[model samples]
Target: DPLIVSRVVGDVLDPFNRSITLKVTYGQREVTNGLDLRPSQVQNKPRVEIGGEDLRNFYTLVMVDPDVPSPSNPHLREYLHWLVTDIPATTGTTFGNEIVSYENPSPTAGIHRVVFILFRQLGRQTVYAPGWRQNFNTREFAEIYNLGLPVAAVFYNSQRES
Candidate 1:
């Protein structure tokens, strides 16, 4: 699977598991699990749908580019793409507080994987954006907000627009 090959499973999510259902769509294009999405198709923040038993429960969504600059030599590793907190279950991200506004993918090199990692919020959270976009650590961010592991995650690959 791309998750294991990309190291998103190892580096970000240790145990491969998710009880909740996560649906991500860019415009009308549904982002299938580990599928490749074009940069032109994702010029804006994709619509994210989180599903769980309780609608009262909240969640945190993070979009990141783990292959910044280039995948062959990812020195800048994780680059933050978007962040939203306090998102209610079953609803889209429009209602949540966007801590870090969405930045469309502009992969300047090899195929870049855009990962959306969703964590079920303990209650309400006061998460903050990283000082810089590069080298943003998913594990540390989860630890900072006491978010535990990701409840669900989905990713799509994209490269620079030719």
Candidate 2:
């Protein structure tokens, strides 16, 4: 059977809260990504969408490990993998990047880890033409049976060193 997986990036996160053990490269003080590096940098819920337009959200973040040996195993379980809500209704937000938007104003609780996954809703405009402008949510999107449409994917291990 095929497994549900999501793409993850960054190494900043609390192992306890993190859904999976990320093998990706951690962030540095001078990381080019302009990361917030703190807890407050992000609003409680950030929004995500496909191509950052159409007022029809499609993209999301999740973490999963298919290699987990068993359902009873802690790692085998589907982890939260982290996700966002309430992203700005603006296009070109990604700016040739993988993520949608990031918080800049640091939070009061010092810096925080951003270790998380990246998911994309590919050719969504092409697949759901009638629902092109439909409401976007876990249920609405999931109801489409996105499971079989290359919904789950992972990043390459080579990124850990970059």
Candidate 3:
């Protein structure tokens, strides 16, 4: 799978025992897992839907670009694209607080892997955005919030226009 070759699973997360659904739509287009999108296609904040059994549960949505700058040499890795916390079940991320305001992908060089990771929050959470965009770690973020592992994750590819 591209997720494995891209190292999103190994670098950011270990193989999980289960999975959940994460829907990402931009305008009327539903982003297929590992689908390719032009920079123009991902200009807006995607409407992210979470699937769970309980409406009382909460979730956190995080978007990152592991291929920041370029795929051949990514020094500014895991550049955060967006983050929302305390999202209620059966609804979209708008229901939560935007810890980091959305910034659409602008992949200056190589194709970037834009990954969205969803965590089932233990309860309501108050999280602050990271001070910088570079060197962000998803595992550390989860550890800080006590979110053991991602319940759901989806990613798409996007690159700069020639």
Q: For residues 130-159, could you state the per-residue lDDT of candidate 2 as single tens digits?
A: 222112232333336352222222332111
Report the error of model 3 at residue 79, Å. 0.3
**Which ten residues in a row are the worst by lDDT in model 1?**
10-19
State the C-alpha lDDT per candidate: 0.85, 0.28, 0.85
Instruction: State the displacement of the C-alpha of residue 55, model 1, in Å, after optimal TM-score superposition.
Output: 2.1
Residue 67 CA displacement from its true place in model 3, Å: 0.9
Residue lDDT tens for model 3, 18-89: 466789998888877788888888888988898875889888998999886787888888898899999888
Residue 128 of model 3, lDDT score: 81
Model 1 per-residue lDDT tens digits across residues 35-85: 878888888888888896598899999888888778888788789989999
- In the order shown, the candidates' Cα RMSDs to the true structure are 1.4, 13.2, 1.3
Badly placed stretches (over 4 Å) of model 1 are none
| Better candidate by lDDT, 1 or 2 | 1
lDDT of residue 38 for candidate 1: 80
Model 3: CA > 4 A from native:
none
